[PDB]
Every structure is written in C-alpha cells, then in structure tokens.
Amino acid sequence: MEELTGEEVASLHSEYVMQSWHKQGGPVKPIKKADGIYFWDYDGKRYTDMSSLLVCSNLGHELPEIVDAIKEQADNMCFMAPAYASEPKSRLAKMLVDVADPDFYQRVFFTNGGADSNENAIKMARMVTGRPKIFSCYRSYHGSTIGASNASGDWRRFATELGGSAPGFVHFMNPNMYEDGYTRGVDDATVTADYLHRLDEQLQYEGPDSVAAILMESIVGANGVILPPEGYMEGVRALCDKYGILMICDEVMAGFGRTGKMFAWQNFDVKPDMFTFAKGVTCGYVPLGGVVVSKRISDYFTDHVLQCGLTYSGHTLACAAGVAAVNYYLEHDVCAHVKEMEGILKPFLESMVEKHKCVGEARCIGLFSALTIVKNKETRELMAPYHTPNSVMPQIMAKLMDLGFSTFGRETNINICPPLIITAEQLEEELPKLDKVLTWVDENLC
Amino acid sequence: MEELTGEEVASLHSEYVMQSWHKQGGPVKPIKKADGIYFWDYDGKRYTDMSSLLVCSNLGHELPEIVDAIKEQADNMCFMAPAYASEPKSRLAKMLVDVADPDFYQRVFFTNGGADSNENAIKMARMVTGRPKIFSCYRSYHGSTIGASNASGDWRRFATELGGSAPGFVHFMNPNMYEDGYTRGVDDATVTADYLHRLDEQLQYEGPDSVAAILMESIVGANGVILPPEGYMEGVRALCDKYGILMICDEVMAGFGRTGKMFAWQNFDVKPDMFTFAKGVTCGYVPLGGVVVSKRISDYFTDHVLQCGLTYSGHTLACAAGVAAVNYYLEHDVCAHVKEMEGILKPFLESMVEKHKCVGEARCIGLFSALTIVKNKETRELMAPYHTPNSVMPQIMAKLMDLGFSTFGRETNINICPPLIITAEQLEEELPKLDKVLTWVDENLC
Ligand SMILES: Cc1ncc(COP(=O)(O)O)c(C=O)c1O
Ligand SMILES: Cc1ncc(COP(=O)(O)O)c(C=O)c1O
Ligand SMILES: N[C@@H](CCC(=O)O)C(=O)O
Ligand SMILES: N[C@@H](CCC(=O)O)C(=O)O
Ligand SMILES: N[C@@H](CCC(=O)O)C(=O)O
Ligand SMILES: N[C@@H](CCC(=O)O)C(=O)O
C-alpha cells in the first residue's frame, strides 16, 4: 500500500474528517501504533493511556487474545444477518447472562454502541410497562442520538433539543456530594435521605403509574466519577419496586471490570431490570453494545413482538471479540487485579487532596477515578463551574499530555481511568506525572 | 473453547439471544460459514444470498481484499480515539469525498451504522439552518432509534411513538406508481407534477422557513425498491433550493454500486447537501456508517462546534475495512459489472410480469430490484396490503428459501438484491428458483 506519512495523516484529517464535539480543521495528533497501555504518534513520542482512551480500552491495546479472536473470525465469517444464529453471538449472549446473573437475566439484545443500547432499553421499557415516561439524571450522559441525548443530563442535550425536547423525558437532580457542599463518609445518610425523597416526590407529581423506567449511570462516569452516597442506589431500586417502574442501569463506561466488579451495579445490592453496555465488552476493538434483560422482560417479548432491530445487531466479528474479551476478564481474574490496583491509585489521589490546594476531592472505585479541581479550597469555588465558557481544564490536560500522561475530563474534573491490565510498577511510574502537573496548577490557577 | 454444534448454536440463540423484530425463542437456522454469494447451515445446505443479507454484503462474503485489510489493521491498531487522526480514517474520508464529488463535498462524519448517521444528519441540518422541522416520506425507513424512527415512515415507527412523537417531524406521502394506479412507462410527468405540488403545498402550510431538511431515501429500498417517477427527485432538489431547505439523501441501502452508480443519488440530476451511508462501505464486515457533508456545511462547523459525537466514530478497524471495500469497487469496476448484470436481471423480472398471474410489477436498477406480488393482476389487489396482519409473504419467502434462494421482502414485495459480484452464470442458476416459486404462488394464493 501507499503508506501515508504522519503529516499526511493529520493533514487529511484536518481537511476531510468531521471531528466529534469540536470545530473542524484544528491541529490534530496522528497516532501510528498502540500496544499495551501505550500509543505512539508518528514522531515516535509515547503516551501512556491513563484514561483507557474514552474509558473503553479496558484490556490495553492490541491484546493478542482479542486481536487473534478477530483474525480467526474474519477467516470464517465477518458478518451474518440477525435472522441467523452464529457461534460467537450465541456464546456471548450466554456468557453475558452468566456473568450478570443467570437466575435473574435471560437475554441480550446486541447493538453497535452505547447510545444504541440506551435507545433500545428506553423503547423496551415503554413497551413492557405500557407507560410513557422515562426518568433520568441531570448529572448523566447516555449518548448523542435524539432519544439517548434527551435522556442525557449534561448540556450536550441542548443541541439535540433544537426543534423541541422529546416527550416523556423527565430529569431529576442527583447528588454530587462534594459539589453540593457535603463530605463523603460523614453525610451519606443525610444526602441519601434528601435526594431519595426529592425523587419520590417528583415521581408522585409526574404520576408513578406513567413512569416506565428510571435510567441511571451505575456510577456517573464522563461527568466525574460521582460516587453516589451510600444507600442511594438501593433506594432508587426500592422506589422502582414500589411503583412498578423498571430500573435501567447504564454500564457503558463503568462496566467490564472498571470498578473491580464485572458490572458496576454489582457494587450495590440491586438487580436492575435491564442494563446497557458497550465499551469494555470488546475494549473498543470492534463496535458492540447491548441490553441485558431480566427473565420477566424476556417473557414479555415471548408473547409480544420485540419492535426493535438494527442491521448489525449481534455482529459476528464483534461478538467473537466479545467472547475473547470476556474470557480474558474471567480467566485472568482481572477484577481482582483491578481491586488490588485500587490500593495504589486511591491512596495516591487522596494524598493529592492533602498535598494540593487545587484538589478538592478524590473519588476512586477500582481503576475508575477522578479529581475535582478547585480554584479555592476554602470556599469550594470550582476551577470550571458547570458548563463554563473557556474552561481552563483543557490547559491542564495538555500539561499532562506533555509528560505522556494522556487523559481527559469534563467540567472541573480530571479522570484517571488507566487500562485494567496496568501494573503496580507502571502506576508508580505515571502517577508522579499527575502530581507534577497538579503542582503547576497550585501555582498558576490557585 | 470447544466448537459448538449446530444444535448447540441454535439452542443457545433461541434461549439467550434477543432477536430483532420477532417474538423471542422461536426456531432458528444456525449459519456456520459464508463465502462469495453463499452461506451454509451446519448440515451443509447452501443458500445463495440473493438479498445480500440486508442488501449490505455488496461484495459477497469473505472477500479476501476486505478480510485481509481487517487482519492487517488488527495487527497494528484495532481502535484509536476520535481526537486522534489515523491512517485508515483519513484515507477513507478523502476517498469517500472523492467518489461523491470533491468540488461539492468536504468532510465525512463517521458513525456505527445507518440509524445514527441519519440521527446526526438531522442534528446537523437543524444546527446549520437553525430551523426545527424535518420532512420525510411515509414510504421510507431510516432506522429504529428514536430520532431515525420518528423520521421513518413505515409502521415500525409506531412503537417508537409510545410516549409521543418527537417534535419537528412532518411526513409527506411519496408516490408508489404501481400501487397508486399509474404506469411507469407512460405516466411519470403527471405523477411527478402532482406529487411535487402536494409537497410544495405542504411545505407552504408548514412554513418553509421552519424546515431544516427534507430527508429521503435516494430510491426507497426495504419498502420495495420504489423507483421514483421521472423528474421527481430533481423537483424535490428544486424545492429545497427555492426554500433554503437542505436535501439529505439516505444511501444506507442504495449506496456503493447497488444501482450501478457509486451512490444512487448519482442516477439523478441532484447534488444533496448531505447523504448518509452504512451497509456497503464495508459490506457489513465491520460496523460503519457516516454522513458526507457539503463544503458549505463543513464551513458552518469550522465556525461552530459540531455538537455531535460517539465513542467509536471513525473506528480504525472499521475504516480499514472501508478503504479496502471502496478500493475494490473502483479497481474492479463493480459499477460497470452491475450495469451489465442489470441487463440480465431486469429482463428476467420483466418477463416474470408477463408470465405470472401473481406479479403486478417489476422494478430493477442495477442489482436493486423487487417484484410487486398481487392476489389479482386485474383489480391490482395486493397480495399483502399495507401493514396487514398475517401476511402470506413469509410463506413465499420460505418456499424460496427451500430452493436455496435466500431473500426477504417488506409489505407486498419480494426483493432481489444479489451481491454485486454475482456472475451471469450464477444469475442463470438462481433465477429459475424464483420462477418456480412464483408458479406455486400463482396456483395457491391467486
Ligand atoms: C456512561 C455512558 N453511557 C453512554 C455513552 C454513549 O456511548 P456511545 O459513544 O457508544 O454512543 C457514553 C460515552 O461517553 C458513556 O460514557
Ligand atoms: C435506507 C435505510 N436507512 C437506514 C437504515 C437503518 O440502518 P441500520 O440498521 O444500520 O441502523 C436502513 C436499514 O434497513 C435502511 O435500509
Ligand atoms: N469523546 C468524544 C471525542 C472527543 C473529540 O473528538 O475531541 C466522543 O464522544 O466522540
Ligand atoms: N431485519 C432484522 C433482522 C433480524 C430478524 O429478522 O430476526 C434486523 O434489522 O436486525
Ligand atoms: N432473509 C434474508 C434477510 C434476513 C433478515 O432480514 O435478517 C437473508 O438473511 O438472506
Ligand atoms: N480523551 C481521549 C479521547 C478524545 C477522542 O475521542 O478523540 C484521549 O485524549 O485519548
């Protein structure tokens, strides 16, 4: 082939590619290769993927087991239509029900990504219950297509709402303990009592008989790893039981080992009626998402036609990578390694709280972590208040990117979501870089 | 693990897989392998893929050029994030702009499939024009997610409408010449004049200044290869020009050689402001879709933030498969071969009209074709009128499947959309199976 130079790759991109969530034509980094927890630009500089790209490359890059499964499947059958059974699609559905809970869940509806599966979970909840309304969090992101974007809490919904908001999407405010003035640990029962009651009250004023589902990120991800107050998720599950509302957990970012469990909702003593997934089901190697449905929902669509579908549902190549990814998580006890890696990451960030005036809070479950950056520790003034213009936080990400610490954040947060295969030696080598950049912020942005 | 038997693969699917557009748990055919224009169940029976699966496997199955590109990309880098340029993504955007028209189009917005590309095309049209409303045809399908399904005409939208129609989606009736009582040879100028005036009048009664886009399949596909009357598509383009409305053509099904041209809208004297694609950009081998946008639209999003995005946009593996597919279409002059195969398929289907009491009309452009099945040639009584319960058409589809002639249809139609690589000899072997089955319909369903 006519292999392109680094400059041509970034040149053509700036000129011909439509970039997500940006204005067109900026400068762009051209990436040549990735492997393990690293990737390289065409100048040869190495970046350590401390955010797993978009918290999706859970097993690092170029994992032989997934790469090999893909190539093997490509030699058999890259795609076969949804109307037919295939080995990878059959095996992955069983594996997913099994790791989720084979006594509660029954079927998996395969999709292309995250927005795709939230869209279909919404449609399925309205069909099963006969009710029109969907409750979702203001502090949440569920996708960019009109249905998932209407359910999404953060301001990316504003553009989708051009022409009008979609009917039946009611938003309720969920607690962000630090930003709301409280202190995790001490105040959990107070915040949980307050926000569970706010939600109960809003349900009553919307008519609980008309609310088909409550949809929640298992742990709010892109918007800052907002660990909920203890007991909050169980109370939501309790409200759903009281009112006949289905509970839908969004596992797109927090699933597949991110938190130390296969699914983040497994940290809570709740069985959601449905939950949605994508990123780590294949570590991003082939697009795949899905909906895991309870036995009750499975039964409903045995009697009624499931009015859902998409050309690539259960894509064969994609599922083959899924089988390899899931088998890797299990055979290599990746959750246990993630729980143990928590022991290096969590104490480190907590000490960044004590050591840095610009770091107000640290949250960490497994390798799912974030820092709240503040302009003023004493007043809790955020370094970038909600939906601020000219947030300085990209500036901070660029200082990090300069040391080979690649990550991202939204609002006033820095995420730290390294690949689940990262080692203690590797963490202890990268985290000093985060401390160095935090010091720069201390001295330049307060 | 241990390879699964056919009976194990079909059992696990029936028990654990969520099937699109069906009640759960039925019987299912397990497919073991695919190659060229065929695929095989686990007993070894061969099916000739006369519908290209979902009119997507444009270059057949396991085509070495795409298979190999996939493996080569998997050995380098399966995925790299949207914020980075990658060789396959830059090369595919330029190649796509180039085959579409480099003097008119500028950028490509990559998605995972067809539905999200229509979702995003809608979002962009509302952002670019500042207007809320989308016009689309009642006889159309654009996807199943809330946005694309509200834009879709056929009854699969009704489920999405649980909870309410999303605002700003106005539907207009497009002509199906045969089903409306006219004749494609002698009647186009009247039908075109009438339906353009109906659309103009409806645009006027909705406020043309409030219509951001008219969205239409270049040639209505899954709903029956409904070739438009002469001059209709050009007149739609004229109304858009008159009123400042963007024209969005959906090439998801009719793109990539299906009709004898690279894009079906290229059979008409129109350049759409945007057009959407999925299936044949990769022949389904890896999920990929997109929006090709004009220079004007690209300019808008140079000055304004493109508030669209998805985790897997510009997926690296998927794009590598795309580069190989598009290069094949061009290097092997697949369009020219499709035109010459049109010269076999069109006369055969036309001769099925003359030969069978049950065949009212034949439509065919390139290898994009369908038969209208009737209970009564004289009264034009359809064999399955719109949205009938207990359609007998699956019976016909099954009689065909029994001869190894695998296809599908919607409403009262049988599609014939074989892979673009099918040869004259192969056509001469398969088409007799369609003739045999039509005789059975003649004698058993009128
Ligand atoms: C928690 C969560 N849900 C849903 C999504 C949307 O997923 P996708 O990009 O695959 O449409 C994302 C991606 O940011 C996410 O982080
Ligand atoms: C013309 C057209 N547009 C859009 C779609 C939806 O595409 P997808 O199933 O990839 O989401 C289809 C699928 O049949 C289609 O035929
Ligand atoms: N995370 C963004 C991509 C980021 C970027 O394009 O700068 C997405 O949803 O695609
Ligand atoms: N047409 C369906 C095919 C699956 C089926 O018929 O079961 C789809 O969009 O996935
Ligand atoms: N029966 C066609 C299409 C099946 C489907 O609609 O999923 C085939 O697979 O060849
Ligand atoms: N923030 C991620 C991804 C941005 C994108 O999706 O392009 C990174 O910097 O690696």
Side-chain angles (χ1 to χ4, degrees), chain A residues 4-6 8-295 297-338 340-354 356-374 376-377 379-424 426-427 429-435 437-446, chain B residues 1-6 8-270 272-295 297-353 355-356 358-377 379-398 400-432 434-446:
Chain A
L4 290 192
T5 75
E8 282 164 323
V9 156
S11 194
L12 286 177
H13 181 279
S14 265
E15 195 198 328
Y16 288 107
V17 162
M18 199 86 144
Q19 176 76 93
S20 281
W21 307 120
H22 262 68
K23 312 211 224 173
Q24 300 315 302
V28 65
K29 202 166 273 297
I31 307 304
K32 167 155 194 170
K33 164 87 212 196
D35 185 64
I37 65 156
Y38 312 106
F39 58 85
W40 292 263
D41 66 18
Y42 277 71
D43 299 336
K45 200 219 175 114
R46 192 193 77 179
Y47 304 84
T48 326
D49 189 20
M50 285 310 267
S51 65
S52 301
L53 291 179
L54 297 163
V55 193
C56 58
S57 299
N58 275 13
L59 301 166
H61 302 298
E62 275 312 300
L63 194 59
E65 278 104 326
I66 299 151
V67 177
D68 292 340
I70 287 164
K71 291 150 97 200
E72 259 146 30
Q73 184 60 44
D75 289 327
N76 178 237
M77 199 175 37
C78 278
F79 177 66
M80 185 55 53
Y84 309 101
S86 73
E87 173 166 334
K89 177 167 84 183
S90 267
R91 211 196 285 284
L92 186 49
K94 177 128 185 290
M95 284 165 75
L96 289 185
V97 166
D98 281 348
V99 301
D101 177 352
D103 300 318
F104 188 84
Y105 303 96
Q106 189 56 67
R107 308 197 171 250
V108 188
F109 178 79
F110 286 118
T111 56
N112 282 331
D116 214 5
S117 35
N118 285 327
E119 297 266 357
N120 281 278
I122 289 178
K123 292 172 73 178
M124 286 191 292
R126 298 172 154 165
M127 272 185 261
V128 154
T129 71
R131 315 171 175 194
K133 309 204 167 153
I134 302 295
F135 270 59
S136 63
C137 294
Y138 271 115
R139 278 196 251 265
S140 82
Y141 175 68
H142 296 288
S144 65
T145 43
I146 307 185
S149 182
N150 261 276
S152 267
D154 69 37
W155 47 273
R156 269 164 311 158
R157 168 172 43 84
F158 297 169
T160 298
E161 279 182 342
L162 287 165
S165 79
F169 289 97
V170 176
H171 293 102
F172 68 96
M173 180 61 61
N174 49 339
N176 177 336
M177 265 169 110
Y178 178 90
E179 263 165 56
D180 285 319
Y182 307 84
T183 290
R184 206 172 259 97
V186 179
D187 302 315
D188 277 45
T190 279
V191 177
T192 280
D194 175 346
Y195 281 81
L196 275 166
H197 176 71
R198 299 194 196 187
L199 179 69
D200 199 2
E201 228 193 353
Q202 191 168 4
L203 287 166
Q204 270 161 258
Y205 267 80
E206 295 290 359
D209 276 327
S210 84
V211 179
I214 292 202
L215 174 58
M216 298 184 76
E217 272 181 273
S218 268
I219 292 140
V220 160
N223 280 277
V225 199
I226 312 177
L227 302 170
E230 226 74 55
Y232 181 78
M233 296 302 307
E234 295 83 356
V236 178
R237 174 75 260 177
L239 292 163
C240 294
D241 292 354
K242 199 199 179 159
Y243 293 121
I245 297 157
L246 292 171
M247 183 173 193
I248 311 182
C249 287
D250 181 329
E251 285 273 323
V252 167
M253 175 162 296
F256 297 94
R258 205 69 226 187
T259 65
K261 298 195 126 272
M262 195 70 9
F263 305 112
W265 65 255
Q266 271 152 354
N267 283 132
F268 287 114
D269 186 8
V270 279
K271 308 281 166 251
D273 291 277
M274 279 182 273
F275 65 94
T276 54
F277 65 87
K279 284 156 191 247
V281 79
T282 69
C283 301
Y285 291 37
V286 190
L288 183 68
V291 199
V292 191
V293 302
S294 65
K295 268 149 207 249
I297 303 169
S298 176
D299 291 337
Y300 178 88
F301 287 110
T302 317
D303 294 319
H304 308 80
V305 168
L306 170 62
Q307 299 290 356
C308 293
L310 66 141
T311 298
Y312 292 146
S313 178
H315 185 279
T316 315
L317 199 76
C319 287
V323 174
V326 168
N327 269 328
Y328 193 90
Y329 290 123
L330 308 173
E331 268 140 33
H332 278 74
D333 321 284
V334 185
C335 296
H337 178 72
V338 167
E340 179 197 316
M341 286 312 105
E342 188 190 281
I344 289 90
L345 177 58
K346 200 159 132 46
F348 177 86
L349 304 158
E350 282 174 359
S351 80
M352 296 301 114
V353 186
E354 296 163 306
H356 287 280
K357 69 184 214 203
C358 80
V359 173
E361 186 180 65
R363 300 166 294 283
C364 194
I365 170 150
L367 291 176
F368 203 26
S369 92
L371 296 186
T372 305
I373 306 308
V374 295
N376 210 287
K377 256 199 155 193
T379 63
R380 294 200 186 186
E381 169 187 1
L382 300 198
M383 180 76 52
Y386 184 67
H387 195 196
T388 204
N390 330 293
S391 162
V392 296
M393 302 291 313
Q395 219 197 135
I396 294 166
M397 306 302 145
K399 300 256 120 182
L400 286 167
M401 199 67 173
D402 291 328
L403 322 177
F405 191 112
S406 168
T407 195
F408 70 105
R410 298 198 45 100
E411 299 313 322
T412 205
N413 314 286
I414 299 159
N415 306 119
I416 300 97
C417 307
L420 308 187
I421 66 189
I422 203 191
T423 63
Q426 262 167 334
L427 266 155
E429 178 185 345
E430 300 298 338
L431 289 176
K433 312 199 198 147
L434 171 64
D435 180 281
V437 189
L438 288 173
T439 290
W440 179 84
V441 191
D442 285 339
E443 309 166 318
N444 286 279
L445 312 149
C446 263
Chain B
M1 314 130 291
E2 261 216 74
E3 196 214 319
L4 295 181
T5 64
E8 286 182 307
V9 155
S11 147
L12 291 213
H13 173 106
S14 266
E15 203 189 333
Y16 290 95
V17 177
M18 201 152 250
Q19 188 61 86
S20 302
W21 313 115
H22 267 63
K23 319 207 194 213
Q24 283 338 280
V28 57
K29 208 168 316 281
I31 294 296
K32 161 164 200 265
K33 163 96 212 177
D35 180 54
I37 75 160
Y38 312 100
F39 57 84
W40 292 263
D41 60 37
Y42 278 83
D43 308 316
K45 199 210 183 129
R46 171 192 87 153
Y47 302 88
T48 320
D49 189 12
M50 294 303 290
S51 79
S52 275
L53 293 190
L54 290 160
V55 200
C56 54
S57 299
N58 275 18
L59 295 179
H61 303 286
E62 291 286 284
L63 188 92
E65 281 78 358
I66 302 156
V67 168
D68 291 342
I70 292 178
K71 309 210 269 174
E72 277 144 25
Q73 196 49 45
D75 285 317
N76 181 58
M77 192 166 66
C78 287
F79 183 61
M80 185 54 49
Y84 309 108
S86 69
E87 198 202 44
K89 173 168 75 185
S90 279
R91 213 206 275 298
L92 190 46
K94 208 229 183 225
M95 289 166 62
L96 287 191
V97 175
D98 277 353
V99 303
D101 180 350
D103 303 325
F104 191 72
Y105 302 94
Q106 198 46 64
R107 309 182 169 277
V108 172
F109 183 71
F110 286 117
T111 65
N112 284 329
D116 53 348
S117 37
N118 285 329
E119 302 259 18
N120 278 305
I122 291 163
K123 279 166 89 193
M124 302 193 259
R126 272 152 176 183
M127 270 179 267
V128 161
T129 65
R131 314 168 171 190
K133 282 173 209 207
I134 301 292
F135 270 49
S136 48
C137 309
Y138 274 122
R139 275 161 178 143
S140 83
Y141 182 72
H142 298 287
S144 41
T145 44
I146 301 197
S149 194
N150 269 277
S152 296
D154 70 32
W155 50 259
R156 291 182 278 186
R157 147 165 65 85
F158 301 171
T160 300
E161 287 186 329
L162 286 160
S165 324
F169 286 96
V170 190
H171 295 98
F172 65 114
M173 182 63 41
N174 41 340
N176 180 343
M177 268 183 115
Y178 181 90
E179 290 193 18
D180 296 328
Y182 312 98
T183 308
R184 215 158 312 260
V186 287
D187 274 332
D188 299 16
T190 306
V191 183
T192 281
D194 165 24
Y195 275 85
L196 291 185
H197 177 260
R198 296 193 202 187
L199 173 59
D200 194 7
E201 217 182 16
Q202 186 179 17
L203 287 167
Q204 264 156 64
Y205 268 89
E206 292 290 0
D209 276 2
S210 76
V211 177
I214 290 182
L215 161 66
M216 31 205 308
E217 287 175 274
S218 294
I219 290 158
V220 160
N223 274 264
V225 193
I226 316 158
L227 304 170
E230 191 65 21
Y232 183 67
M233 291 316 270
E234 284 85 359
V236 177
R237 176 72 265 189
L239 302 171
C240 296
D241 289 348
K242 188 176 163 147
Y243 290 124
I245 295 154
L246 305 173
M247 185 181 197
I248 312 174
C249 292
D250 182 334
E251 297 276 322
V252 162
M253 174 157 311
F256 296 101
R258 186 36 70 166
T259 72
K261 282 251 181 25
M262 190 77 22
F263 300 117
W265 61 259
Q266 278 156 352
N267 294 279
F268 307 109
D269 187 3
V270 311
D273 295 271
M274 280 181 289
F275 61 99
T276 57
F277 64 87
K279 288 144 124 140
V281 72
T282 81
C283 306
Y285 291 17
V286 188
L288 183 58
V291 193
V292 189
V293 310
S294 66
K295 273 164 211 294
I297 292 177
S298 169
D299 281 351
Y300 182 89
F301 290 111
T302 307
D303 310 300
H304 303 76
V305 169
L306 175 66
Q307 302 286 19
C308 296
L310 52 143
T311 289
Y312 293 152
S313 176
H315 190 285
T316 316
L317 198 81
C319 283
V323 166
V326 172
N327 271 335
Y328 193 98
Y329 290 128
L330 299 180
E331 280 156 39
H332 286 246
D333 208 336
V334 168
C335 285
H337 174 73
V338 173
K339 204 74 184 57
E340 152 188 353
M341 297 300 94
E342 176 188 281
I344 305 194
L345 174 73
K346 189 163 183 271
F348 173 81
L349 298 162
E350 281 174 17
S351 77
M352 292 294 102
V353 175
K355 186 183 159 160
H356 291 275
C358 77
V359 173
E361 205 203 1
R363 297 167 300 289
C364 170
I365 187 170
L367 291 170
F368 203 35
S369 86
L371 300 181
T372 301
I373 308 309
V374 294
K375 248 206 171 272
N376 202 292
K377 223 159 166 264
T379 76
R380 283 205 196 184
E381 178 191 354
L382 307 185
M383 177 77 74
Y386 185 71
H387 200 193
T388 199
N390 318 303
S391 160
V392 297
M393 302 288 316
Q395 224 173 308
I396 309 175
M397 248 44 91
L400 281 168
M401 190 66 171
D402 289 334
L403 312 185
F405 189 111
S406 149
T407 195
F408 78 102
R410 286 198 65 92
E411 288 334 311
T412 206
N413 310 98
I414 311 180
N415 300 321
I416 301 97
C417 308
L420 304 198
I421 63 180
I422 206 176
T423 65
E425 194 227 319
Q426 277 168 315
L427 285 175
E428 266 131 38
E429 320 184 314
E430 294 307 328
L431 290 184
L434 176 63
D435 177 86
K436 295 336 205 329
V437 166
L438 299 183
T439 284
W440 174 98
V441 169
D442 278 1
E443 295 159 355
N444 286 116
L445 312 168
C446 311

